[PDB]
């Protein structure tokens, strides 16, 4: 059950401060990552097809650091913790080992 | 599968060395560290079933840190060719996660 979701142009996918449960892979369209500071919207990046966002919510299970809006009609593949564990557990030993030390390193970094 | 034993306090490799393979710790523990002006700054300690020395392989440059054995250790050698082969053949979503992790670790 790898589910997709379609998102209309100009839809806020999520907002800075929101609860974070999953990441998203862009299957079609583009998205704006941004912050809002005193009613002024400050862009950070634009992501397109085959790129992933919201991944700190996935590994660390905490709030959204930025807002994300769709610049056009987009499709998103939802990536949930259950999928990640399932895919890492079923992976090759060396790949599993790399994923572990990467995640362990990213936790020490973000301290 | 070739293994290698490393004596306690042996430098496995050093920051700045050429990087040809990674290692999975089969026995013992290892210290990952940097050296700044004869002062040694620890980063992490890894133990059994953990892997190091990947970064030279996937990013294709030198060793970013030094590694020493804290006790007698045994290491399974994983050649560069194996690591690239196994990561490239891995599942699309897993590859995508590894990329953004690495991109984050660089920033
Ligand atoms: N915080 C870290 N900084 C640099 N290297 C690290 C760190 N944690 C683990 N390592 C590992 O130490 C290794 C040092 O040589 P590599 O560049 O080949 O790959 C590195 C990583 O696998």
């Amino acid at each position: 059950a790898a589910q997709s979701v379609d998102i209309h142009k100009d839809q806020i996918i999520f907002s800075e401060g929101d609860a974070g449960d999953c990441a998203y892979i862009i299957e079609k369209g583009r998205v704006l990552i941004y912050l809002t500071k005193d009613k002024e919207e400050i862009p950070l990046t634009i992501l397109g097809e085959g790129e992933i966002f919201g991944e700190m919510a996935l590994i660390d299970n905490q709030n959204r650091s930025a807002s994300v809006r769709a610049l056009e009609d987009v499709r998103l593949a939802i990536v949930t913790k259950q999928q990640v564990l399932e895919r890492v557990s079923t992976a090759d030993k060396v790949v599993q080992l790399l994923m572990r030390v990467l995640l362990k390193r990213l936790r020490r970094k973000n301290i």
Side-chain angles (χ1 to χ4, degrees), chain A:
Chain A
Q3 255 72 28
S4 292
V5 56
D6 298 335
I7 296 293
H8 290 83
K9 176 176 177 206
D10 300 325
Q11 245 175 231
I12 285 181
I13 304 278
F14 58 75
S15 300
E16 175 178 22
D18 288 2
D21 206 350
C22 64
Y24 304 88
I25 299 163
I26 298 158
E27 286 182 336
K28 200 177 209 192
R30 296 175 298 123
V31 298
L32 173 59
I33 286 58
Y34 67 103
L35 311 172
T36 323
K37 299 291 116 136
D38 322 277
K39 316 183 279 142
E40 285 300 62
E41 150 178 319
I42 320 298
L44 295 163
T45 307
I46 294 173
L47 308 181
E49 182 190 341
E51 284 186 275
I52 194 171
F53 62 95
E55 71 276 359
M56 291 308 91
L58 199 59
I59 78 196
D60 262 38
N61 208 170
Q62 83 302 22
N63 298 348
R64 299 304 192 174
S65 56
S67 297
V68 181
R69 192 173 64 250
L71 295 169
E72 65 208 61
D73 287 343
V74 309
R75 180 178 287 182
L76 289 180
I78 305 107
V79 192
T80 158
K81 284 149 189 281
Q82 290 140 299
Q83 271 188 72
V84 175
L85 278 255
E86 186 142 281
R87 294 163 181 288
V88 175
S89 66
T90 202
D92 224 293
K93 173 160 62 116
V94 168
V95 166
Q96 297 192 32
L97 286 180
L98 284 178
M99 281 283 309
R100 297 222 208 88
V101 76
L102 272 288
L103 295 161
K104 178 262 298 151
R105 204 175 296 148
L106 213 45
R107 294 187 218 101
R108 290 193 291 112
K109 170 148 187 146
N110 293 338
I111 261 62

